[PDB]
Design a protein around this ligand. Structure first.
Ligand SMILES: N[C@@H](CCC(=O)O)C(=O)O
Lengths: 51, 49
């Protein structure tokens, strides 16, 4: 919102490119790939019989 | 040269390329890797000797 209201020129940070923002602000090329991922704790490993 | 108006192909976004043509947002985010031949374990008949 501080680039929309001309309060600054660029917004360097963890901004993700998406269609909603790119219609109101110009995004540079992605300098790192991100997205949506799910983080969970590891499950209890079970040793299969007949090993 | 005007022969094609678009390049729908795996065109990586390069610095030298982007100077002359205008790219888009990527479809596939990927890098470069090395493809080798899997080491097939060959066995003879006297391997126990
Ligand atoms: N990096 C996101 C916020 C964090 C999230 O993915 O929820 C953004 O710039 O909007």
């Amino acid at each position: 919102g501080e680039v929309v209201m001309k309060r600054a020129y660029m917004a360097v940070g963890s901004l993700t490119i998406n269609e909603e923002r790119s219609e109101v602000v110009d995004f540079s090329v992605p300098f790192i790939e991100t997205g949506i991922s799910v983080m969970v704790s590891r499950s209890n490993g079970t040793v299969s019989p007949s090993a | 040269s005007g022969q094609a108006d678009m390049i729908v192909a795996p065109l990586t976004i390069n610095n030298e390329r982007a100077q002359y043509i205008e790219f888009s947002k990527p479809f596939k985010y990927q890098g470069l890797t090395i493809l080798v031949k899997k080491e097939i374990p060959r066995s003879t008949l006297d391997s126990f000797m």
